[PDB]
Curated annotation (Swiss-Prot), chains A, B:
The gene coding this protein: IDH
Alphabetized GO MF terms: isocitrate dehydrogenase (NAD+) activity; isocitrate dehydrogenase (NADP+) activity; magnesium ion binding; protein homodimerization activity
Manner of cofactor binding, per the entry note: Binds 1 Mg(2+) or Mn(2+) ion per subunit.
Keyword vocabulary terms for this entry: Magnesium, Manganese, Metal-binding, Mitochondrion, NAD, Oxidoreductase, Transit peptide, Tricarboxylic acid cycle
Binding site for D-threo-isocitrate: 93-99, 129, 136, 211, 255, 279
GO-annotated biological processes: isocitrate metabolic process; NAD metabolic process; NADP metabolic process; tricarboxylic acid cycle
Cross-referenced Pfam families: Iso_dh
Residues annotated for Mg(2+) binding in this entry: 255, 279, 283
InterPro entries to which the protein is assigned, alphabetical: Isocitrate_DH_NADP, IsoPropMal-DH-like_dom
Reactions mediated catalytically: D-threo-isocitrate + NAD(+) = 2-oxoglutarate + CO2 + NADH
Record-given protein name: Isocitrate dehydrogenase (NAD(+)), mitochondrial
Annotated phenotype, changing residue 321 to R: Decreases affinity for NAD(+) 3-fold. Decreases affinity for NAD(+) 78-fold
Upper lineage: Eukaryota, Viridiplantae, Chlorophyta, Mamiellophyceae, Mamiellales
EC number: 1.1.1.41
Enzyme kind, highest EC tier: oxidoreductase
Amino acid sequence: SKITAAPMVYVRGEEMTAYVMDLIRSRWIEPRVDVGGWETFDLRAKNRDDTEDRVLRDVIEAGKRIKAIFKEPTVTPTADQVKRLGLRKSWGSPNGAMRRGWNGITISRDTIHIDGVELGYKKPVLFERHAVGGEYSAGYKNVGKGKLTTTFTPSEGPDAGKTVVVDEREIVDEEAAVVTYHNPYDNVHDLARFFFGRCLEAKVTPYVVTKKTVFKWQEPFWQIMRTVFDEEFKAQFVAAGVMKEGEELVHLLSDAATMKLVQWRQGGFGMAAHNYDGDVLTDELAQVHKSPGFITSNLVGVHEDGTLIKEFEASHGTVADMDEARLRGEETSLNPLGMVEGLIGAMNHAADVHNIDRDRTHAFTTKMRTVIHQLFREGKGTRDLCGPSGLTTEQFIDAVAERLD
Amino acid sequence: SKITAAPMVYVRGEEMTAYVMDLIRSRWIEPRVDVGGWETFDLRAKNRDDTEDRVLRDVIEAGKRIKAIFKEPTVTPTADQVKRLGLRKSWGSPNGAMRRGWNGITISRDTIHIDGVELGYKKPVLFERHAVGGEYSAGYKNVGKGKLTTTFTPSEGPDAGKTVVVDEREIVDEEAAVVTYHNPYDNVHDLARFFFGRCLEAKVTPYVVTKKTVFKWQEPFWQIMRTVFDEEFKAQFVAAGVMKEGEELVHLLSDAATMKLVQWRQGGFGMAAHNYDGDVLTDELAQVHKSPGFITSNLVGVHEDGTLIKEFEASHGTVADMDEARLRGEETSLNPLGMVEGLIGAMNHAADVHNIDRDRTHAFTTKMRTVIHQLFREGKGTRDLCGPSGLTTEQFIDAVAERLD
Ligand SMILES: [Mg+2]
């Protein structure tokens, strides 16, 4: 019989990556898997506009309920896409809605590896980008001269109801930005446990990255991480052979971390950072490793009941330049590994959360990865890695289908 | 007849770098250049303490007057140095006082090259780090649950004197940072002119780097840059053959620029960014190129009279490990190029801003660089680049001196 897929959210996009995933689902998944449990959504930019973003709200509900989401690369309906695709209004990135809706802890941005193919980092690197806070949720104005004041009124504790001044300053420029944001740090306890748990299992040395020497409000990010590490993990990292006895958890300034990403070509490390530092440093990570497609973008949140909500995504876009070449009838070569890693992660997590056909699902997802890697080893991978004698998009997809059983 | 040095501020530090520059002043500069106009200051940590920091104030006043400063690496008299150096008390970093005193608008962070020795970037790269604003001067608090409010009362325009809300948010975490900052943008006009002028002279393509797509308050950094470019430079870039007719100034997202720094190993570009982004990106630049010592750290400010105050530094410390080796009688090999590039920059600026012996100064500073590079090509540079067969600190210094004429 076919494998019974556990409940999972599937978010379809458009252009080259949707064409490729249509093929993968029809030729790899569907012959071997009953996908009745998959709740599919059309997140075309046109469909987000056509539905007034009801589809995005349905995605968020489904994700809370099901706990496991695969999302394809999607076209954010920016002002430029309104012009091109002929939309009625512009819509922001869906990332904010997912990160708030699923109580986001981290975006895991890990290097993707192929056994037998050398990429930039020799051994796995793990990266946690704190999923919330910082300038991504700032309030701001662009102003001239005047008086800026920031007040805070606690709602509990000894000084509940008493307003204090956080900051007061005089703007003396005709043009200035004024900006306020917050970092919520309660979930850094969860982040730390998630990060250090991962790093231990991977046997990689963990590092915490901030600008806390100068941006002193970040100190709790470090302190929370170090406390969890010392109390709950340090002896375990010693016993795993990862760190020497007496070796303390290392703090890296963001300034240093940017240098270490270029230097540490052997890999075998983990970093955790705030939202913006994570955004920047993981794109650097992508470039050093190979390209955006070879780093994960795995959002990890938590339901109110304590079950982890995991969404998985490739880190490249929809690849319109290649899609246009397809409709002109020219040969394409899209590497589907990024998206497949995400689908694997989503299918695996769905199987674990719901305990539906768990053994057979892990065996099948493992088999997909193994077959993919073996083809790359054999010189039958896509042209990004195997050169001009590498396979086209369709040849690669058919090659895997023939190998799968 | 010696070259007449223009008025210049010389700030001496301590340890190995002061020892080296003492030899360079004695053996390269003084025999060939009348340094009567140099005002020299002793910025040993011990001397900041011994003068109750009058020496720092004297440096700042002289720099305002003279407009050209070379500063050696220095040891900030932190709490850690008090016991070690026998100080009465600790003293803060001088950098803020220098930046405010000299109306700093940018820290210029440029790659340093040796003709015939391959470093990371083949051709010069220029970087401007905006020297003001951002989280470096943020007000902040670490708080629990409560209401945060940011208001602004403009002092000009039709709504002058009326308070408006910039931001309002409810803090729902037991542990959170709340942060307010501003970006003064009036001086981006001056920064733009300086940046594009330098890029034109260098014949490199300029790029502006921000996160303005998400951090929308940054938009004016781009708008001011692009407006100055279009109105005052684009035609000249076309005339010089640096850019083609109809080629527009490019904006790079900060997380794209981190990838470009690894990718663009040919060099031959310039970037301008906000304070924090510059701080992080220029260290990445250091690591790609070679190490921090091969990138400049030159503060540039605008004098009230319209001319520029320029201060030049190397981006390494005082090299205490070599100083200790030196004092035990062991061989050393300090590469003085970073500091020499700084001194060259200061002497050239002094000659140019005061219009004193420009041709002879520029010829002499060019000669020092030409002699240095040739020695490295012969394998008679310092041991960092030339291996164990390279010259010692003193041998290298004497090798240059005998070739200067
Ligand atoms: Mg830095």
